[PDB]
Design an enzyme around this catalytic site. Structure first.
Site, PDB file in Angstrom:
ATOM      1  N   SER A 197      -7.133  -8.074   9.243  1.00  0.00           N
ATOM      2  CA  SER A 197      -8.444  -8.578   9.237  1.00  0.00           C
ATOM      3  C   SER A 197      -8.747  -9.018   7.816  1.00  0.00           C
ATOM      4  O   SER A 197      -9.815  -9.591   7.557  1.00  0.00           O
ATOM      5  CB  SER A 197      -9.430  -7.489   9.738  1.00  0.00           C
ATOM      6  OG  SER A 197      -9.546  -6.444   8.781  1.00  0.00           O
TER       7      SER A 197
ATOM      8  N   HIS B 174       0.829  -1.212   0.000  1.00  0.00           N
ATOM      9  CA  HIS B 174       0.000   0.000   0.000  1.00  0.00           C
ATOM     10  C   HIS B 174       0.847   1.238   0.000  1.00  0.00           C
ATOM     11  O   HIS B 174       0.294   2.280   0.166  1.00  0.00           O
ATOM     12  CB  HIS B 174      -1.027  -0.011   1.138  1.00  0.00           C
ATOM     13  CG  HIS B 174      -2.001  -1.129   1.042  1.00  0.00           C
ATOM     14  ND1 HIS B 174      -2.797  -1.545   2.101  1.00  0.00           N
ATOM     15  CD2 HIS B 174      -2.268  -1.977   0.010  1.00  0.00           C
ATOM     16  CE1 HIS B 174      -3.499  -2.582   1.725  1.00  0.00           C
ATOM     17  NE2 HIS B 174      -3.192  -2.880   0.477  1.00  0.00           N
TER      18      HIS B 174
HETATM   19  N1  LIG Z   1      -1.617  -6.361  19.225  1.00  0.00           N
HETATM   20  C1  LIG Z   1      -2.348  -7.134  18.430  1.00  0.00           C
HETATM   21  N2  LIG Z   1      -2.260  -8.496  18.348  1.00  0.00           N
HETATM   22  C2  LIG Z   1      -3.078  -9.155  17.512  1.00  0.00           C
HETATM   23  N3  LIG Z   1      -4.002  -8.619  16.717  1.00  0.00           N
HETATM   24  C3  LIG Z   1      -4.112  -7.241  16.686  1.00  0.00           C
HETATM   25  C4  LIG Z   1      -3.377  -6.434  17.617  1.00  0.00           C
HETATM   26  N4  LIG Z   1      -3.769  -5.196  17.439  1.00  0.00           N
HETATM   27  C5  LIG Z   1      -4.656  -5.158  16.479  1.00  0.00           C
HETATM   28  N5  LIG Z   1      -4.889  -6.401  16.058  1.00  0.00           N
HETATM   29  C6  LIG Z   1      -5.895  -6.812  15.044  1.00  0.00           C
HETATM   30  O1  LIG Z   1      -5.354  -6.367  13.841  1.00  0.00           O
HETATM   31  C7  LIG Z   1      -6.331  -6.418  12.785  1.00  0.00           C
HETATM   32  C8  LIG Z   1      -5.958  -5.251  11.916  1.00  0.00           C
HETATM   33  O2  LIG Z   1      -6.964  -5.116  10.850  1.00  0.00           O
HETATM   34  P1  LIG Z   1      -7.257  -3.722  10.097  1.00  0.00           P
HETATM   35  O3  LIG Z   1      -7.351  -2.821  11.319  1.00  0.00           O
HETATM   36  O4  LIG Z   1      -8.313  -4.007   9.103  1.00  0.00           O
HETATM   37  O5  LIG Z   1      -5.880  -3.435   9.285  1.00  0.00           O
HETATM   38  P2  LIG Z   1      -5.408  -4.128   7.881  1.00  0.00           P
HETATM   39  O6  LIG Z   1      -3.863  -4.071   8.030  1.00  0.00           O
HETATM   40  O7  LIG Z   1      -5.870  -5.575   7.630  1.00  0.00           O
HETATM   41  O8  LIG Z   1      -5.988  -3.116   6.887  1.00  0.00           O
HETATM   42  C9  LIG Z   1      -5.856  -3.304   5.469  1.00  0.00           C
HETATM   43  C10 LIG Z   1      -5.778  -1.926   4.872  1.00  0.00           C
HETATM   44  O9  LIG Z   1      -7.105  -1.300   5.012  1.00  0.00           O
HETATM   45  C11 LIG Z   1      -6.940   0.100   5.341  1.00  0.00           C
HETATM   46  O10 LIG Z   1      -7.981   0.781   4.609  1.00  0.00           O
HETATM   47  C12 LIG Z   1      -5.462   0.411   4.950  1.00  0.00           C
HETATM   48  O11 LIG Z   1      -5.447   0.515   3.530  1.00  0.00           O
HETATM   49  C13 LIG Z   1      -4.742  -0.930   5.313  1.00  0.00           C
HETATM   50  O12 LIG Z   1      -3.472  -1.131   4.562  1.00  0.00           O
HETATM   51  C14 LIG Z   1      -7.662  -6.178  13.527  1.00  0.00           C
HETATM   52  O13 LIG Z   1      -8.505  -7.236  13.008  1.00  0.00           O
HETATM   53  C15 LIG Z   1      -7.279  -6.187  15.023  1.00  0.00           C
HETATM   54  O14 LIG Z   1      -8.133  -6.992  15.821  1.00  0.00           O
END
Ligand SMILES: Nc1ncnc2c1ncn2[C@@H]1O[C@H](COP(=O)(O)OP(=O)(O)OC[C@H]2O[C@H](O)[C@H](O)[C@@H]2O)[C@@H](O)[C@H]1O
Ligand SMILES: Oc1ccc2ccccc2c1-c1nc2ccccc2n2cccc12
Ligand SMILES: [Zn+2]
Length: 282
Positions: free
Chosen positions: A200, A124
């Site tokens: 997620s 990204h």
């Molecule tokens: N400390 C932790 N340990 C485990 N899980 C965690 C923690 N903290 C957070 N989480 C989990 O981490 C997950 C993070 O999910 P999302 O928040 O969707 O981030 P993406 O990286 O998949 O987002 C994709 C793109 O979308 C955007 O529009 C941008 O374009 C991004 O690049 C959650 O389900 C939390 O429960």
């Protein structure tokens, strides 16, 4: 743009209790030991323990925006330190247990952690990186590049060129970088284990790549506090804090999590270091 689909936000968190969590991290060790090609997929949840909010967590950016609240940062991007998870990924690559690293994060932390850029796809973009429109040369800066959306930053290319330099932060409409995507896809397809950390998996095609590993018999591990889009396709799902999972994992594997020297850029993966011998798995 303002009605961009932000997906499912603020779903309830799951906590595997302790004995179940130990048992699952032992099984993840098992699969690491048995695999010839391990690809890791990371998202925003690997950086929350460094002060950077995620997108869809309970206090994620989009989650909070849905309820009218602001997300909260406990650091700047420049002052953020790589987590125990980031550094554990640095080591796993150095000892030859990680073949490739796919990341959706733009926070710069994988590059700053010392992780080699030729084994990394930053699907990204990266907020510290600018790119020359003319020759395509990238510059990894020590400060965040002021713009988002593939715009001109105001600086020029210094190659032995004067091209406009632009940010690499993709907007809603912007297609992924072809290089990064092609290499993530290849990696994902050939891998025999894909392990997802703190994503997620809702964005496509980023969130789909781990499924590519399923094609020819590959195993899929998902490590996330919330449910994720592909949970049903996972061979293992571990509901815990990623720093706790990764530190347990490294301990089983017999590896130290190395020290962060401060911000460093490594272009090319060094020669692979010795690693412990593998247990007998009956
Ligand atoms: N400390 C932790 N340990 C485990 N899980 C965690 C923690 N903290 C957070 N989480 C989990 O981490 C997950 C993070 O999910 P999302 O928040 O969707 O981030 P993406 O990286 O998949 O987002 C994709 C793109 O979308 C955007 O529009 C941008 O374009 C991004 O690049 C959650 O389900 C939390 O429960
Ligand atoms: O653009 C980034 C870039 C990196 C991040 C890392 C962690 C959390 C949020 C962001 C954000 C985010 N993007 C936004 C896009 C449009 C409108 C507001 C946004 N936002 C507000 C705070 C953080 C962000
Ligand atoms: Zn140039």
């Amino acid at each position: 743009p303002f009605t961009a689909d932000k997906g499912k936000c603020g779903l309830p968190e799951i906590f595997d209790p302790p004995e179940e969590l130990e048992r699952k991290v032992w099984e993840l060790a098992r699969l690491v030991w048995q695999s010839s090609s391990v690809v890791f997929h990371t998202g925003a949840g690997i950086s929350t323990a460094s002060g950077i909010p995620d997108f869809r967590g309970p206090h994620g950016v989009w989650t909070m925006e849905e309820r009218g609240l602001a997300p909260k940062f406990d650091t700047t991007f420049e002052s953020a330190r790589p987590t125990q998870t980031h550094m554990a990924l640095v080591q796993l690559e150095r000892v030859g247990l990680l073949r490739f690293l796919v990341s959706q994060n733009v926070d710069g932390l994988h590059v700053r952690s010392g992780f080699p850029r030729d084994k990394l796809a930053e699907l990204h973009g990266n907020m510290f990186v600018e790119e020359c429109a003319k020759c395509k040369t990238q510059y990894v800066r020590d400060t965040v590049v002021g713009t988002m959306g593939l715009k001109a930053t105001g600086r020029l290319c210094t190659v032995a060129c004067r091209g406009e330099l632009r940010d690499t932060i993709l907007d809603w409409e912007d297609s992924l970088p072809d290089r990064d995507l092609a290499l993530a896809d290849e990696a994902s397809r050939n891998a025999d284990l894909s392990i997802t950390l703190g994503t997620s998996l809702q964005i496509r095609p980023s969130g789909n790549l781990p499924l590519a590993t399923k094609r020819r018999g590959g195993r899929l591990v998902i490590v996330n506090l919330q449910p994720t889009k592909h949970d049903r396709h996972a061979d293992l799902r571990i509901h815990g804090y990623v720093d706790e999972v990764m530190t347990r994992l490294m301990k089983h594997l017999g590896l130290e999590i190395p020290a962060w020297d401060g911000p460093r850029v490594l272009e090319r993966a060094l020669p692979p270091l010795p690693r412990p011998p593998t247990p007998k798995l009956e």
